[PDB]
Amino acid sequence: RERNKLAAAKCRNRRRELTDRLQAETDQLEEEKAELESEIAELQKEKERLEFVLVAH
Amino acid sequence: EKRRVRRERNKLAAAKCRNRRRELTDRLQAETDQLEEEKAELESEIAELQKEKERLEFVLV
Amino acid sequence: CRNRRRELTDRLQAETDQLEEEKAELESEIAELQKEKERLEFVLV
Amino acid sequence: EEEEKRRVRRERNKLAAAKCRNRRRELTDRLQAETDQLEEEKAELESEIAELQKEKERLEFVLVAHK
Ligand SMILES: [Cl-]
Ligand SMILES: [Cl-]
Ligand SMILES: [Cl-]
């Protein structure tokens, strides 16, 4: 009853740590998506600038 | 009739905790795999842009 | 002929200016993607 | 001397004209090289956009799909 108490406390502590680490890593994926969305926008602008130039050649 | 049910209840909560830990580790690994793939893809695009810049410098000179 | 060379010379200057700006845009894009790579390396402990 | 000088002047013009013709050729070739670079970079951009879009799609799948 004494060593099961400790073992169970550690398990729940490890579970809680993983739950928090997953919330944090999910936020980063959501930030990486937004950052990709802005990189996509940037390259589409350069693409239109080039299309604008090439039509005249 | 209590010290048995309580022991069974504890053994089951322990299995459930470890099972939740395993599932959280798997989900974390899937998210980490995705970040590593994104990093790999960026390294690939950088290499592609750097080559195209070199080809651009070649025609300029 | 003389007039042709002059026209071509001016067209080439204009197009070379366009590649010059394009080169700078690629340097910018490379710089951005390296910044993002550096951050992911960080996020990845 | 006067007459000889004028002929020389004519032969130098043949030289100049030849130099001009070859300059026109060099300029045309370089203009094409530069246009071909822009055209391929436009295409490479289009492929880089499409690849970042797929990376975003794969990122979104991980965020919303669940085992
Ligand atoms: Cl532990
Ligand atoms: Cl159950
Ligand atoms: Cl999952």
Side-chain angles (χ1 to χ4, degrees), chain A residues 3-22 24-57, chain B residues 4 8-61, chain C residues 1-5 7-37 39-45, chain D residues 3-5 7-9 11-18 20 22-24 26-67:
Chain A
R3 182 48 240 208
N4 300 331
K5 199 144 180 61
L6 175 59
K10 289 198 202 186
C11 188
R12 293 187 295 264
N13 288 341
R14 303 293 85 74
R15 184 209 51 78
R16 284 179 201 104
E17 293 162 3
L18 292 170
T19 296
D20 291 351
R21 176 156 182 154
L22 182 58
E25 194 160 338
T26 297
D27 286 347
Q28 180 53 232
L29 270 63
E30 289 281 1
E31 184 57 38
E32 286 300 343
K33 177 173 75 181
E35 203 61 15
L36 288 179
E37 287 173 316
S38 91
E39 284 175 349
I40 291 167
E42 98 200 354
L43 301 176
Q44 288 172 328
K45 302 273 222 282
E46 175 63 11
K47 191 210 95 156
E48 299 156 10
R49 279 192 295 271
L50 285 185
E51 278 174 342
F52 192 81
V53 165
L54 282 158
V55 167
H57 283 117
Chain B
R4 191 227 181 275
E8 166 54 25
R9 185 245 287 171
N10 285 347
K11 181 180 180 180
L12 180 273
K16 276 177 157 285
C17 172
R18 293 188 289 271
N19 287 342
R20 298 301 88 72
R21 287 168 63 188
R22 291 179 191 104
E23 293 153 11
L24 289 165
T25 298
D26 196 53
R27 174 70 170 192
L28 274 165
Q29 192 62 66
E31 290 192 348
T32 299
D33 287 349
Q34 184 56 54
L35 293 170
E36 295 179 315
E37 176 203 329
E38 176 182 356
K39 185 183 113 73
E41 285 286 1
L42 295 181
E43 296 173 341
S44 165
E45 285 233 326
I46 286 160
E48 193 185 330
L49 297 170
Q50 274 165 342
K51 276 176 43 155
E52 183 54 45
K53 178 174 70 64
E54 256 207 335
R55 280 148 68 186
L56 197 166
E57 282 158 348
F58 159 84
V59 311
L60 279 181
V61 184
Chain C
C1 202
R2 291 203 313 269
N3 279 334
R4 284 221 56 73
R5 179 185 58 203
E7 288 182 36
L8 291 174
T9 299
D10 291 328
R11 287 196 198 253
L12 185 61
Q13 188 59 68
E15 191 156 4
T16 298
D17 288 344
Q18 291 168 345
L19 270 61
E20 204 63 48
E21 182 159 20
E22 178 205 348
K23 192 185 70 177
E25 290 288 354
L26 287 173
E27 286 162 341
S28 172
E29 290 166 14
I30 292 164
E32 173 72 12
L33 297 193
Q34 281 165 338
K35 304 261 188 305
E36 199 146 331
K37 156 165 177 292
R39 174 175 189 190
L40 279 174
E41 269 160 358
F42 167 61
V43 156
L44 291 162
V45 165
Chain D
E3 174 266 334
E4 174 71 1
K5 284 193 228 150
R7 174 206 160 250
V8 163
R9 193 72 209 175
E11 218 79 10
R12 299 196 157 119
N13 296 338
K14 297 176 178 181
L15 172 67
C20 179
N22 290 305
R23 181 57 175 180
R24 278 185 50 248
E26 300 154 39
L27 291 161
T28 293
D29 287 347
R30 183 129 176 256
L31 277 160
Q32 189 68 247
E34 291 186 352
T35 301
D36 293 342
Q37 184 285 326
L38 288 168
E39 178 66 16
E40 178 147 32
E41 163 57 13
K42 175 183 124 291
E44 292 214 348
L45 273 167
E46 287 170 332
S47 171
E48 284 149 355
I49 288 171
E51 180 51 37
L52 293 185
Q53 284 171 333
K54 282 165 183 159
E55 191 66 31
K56 199 197 72 158
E57 293 166 356
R58 291 190 280 261
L59 211 326
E60 171 74 341
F61 184 87
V62 176
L63 284 169
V64 308
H66 198 86
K67 292 192 168 180

